[PDB]
Amino acid sequence: GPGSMYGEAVTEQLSRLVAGFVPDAAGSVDPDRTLLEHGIDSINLMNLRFEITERFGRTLPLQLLSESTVPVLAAHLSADRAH
Numbered sequence: 001g002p003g004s005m006y007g008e009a010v011t012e013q014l015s016r017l018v019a020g021f022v023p024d025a026a027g028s029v030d031p032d033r034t035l036l037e038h039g040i041d042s043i044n045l046m047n048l049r050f051e052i053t054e055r056f057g058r059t060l061p062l063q064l065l066s067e068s069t070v071p072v073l074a075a076h077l078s079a080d081r082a083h
């Protein structure tokens with residue numbers, strides 16, 4: 001009808017989080033590359049895993065985190081509604 005509500009996106013919330021864990025001179029994460037392509041070491045993948053646990057109530061293995069991109073990880077987190 002005349003009223004509408006757009007809502008927030010999980011891909012943005014994980015994107016701006018992962019942009020805080022890239023160890024290279026990169027200023028932001030590229031969505032078409034993996035966390036292993038950004039070169040994120042196990043310590044920072046475990047810090048990302050803990051932040052995702054606190055923010056979404058979800059936990060994922062380092063073997064998935066290294067092989068996955070930002071949209072692929074966001075699709076696993078977005079598998080149930082929270083709003």
Ligand SMILES: *P(=O)(O)OCC(C)(C)[C@@H](O)C(=O)NCCC(=O)NCCS
Binds near residue numbers: 042043062
């Ligand atoms: P990364 O997985 O290369 O780990 C580097 C480390 C400095 C944290 C090192 O102490 C280590 O090998 N820890 C064990 C990491 C682990 O068990 N990961 C889960 C399987 S990918």
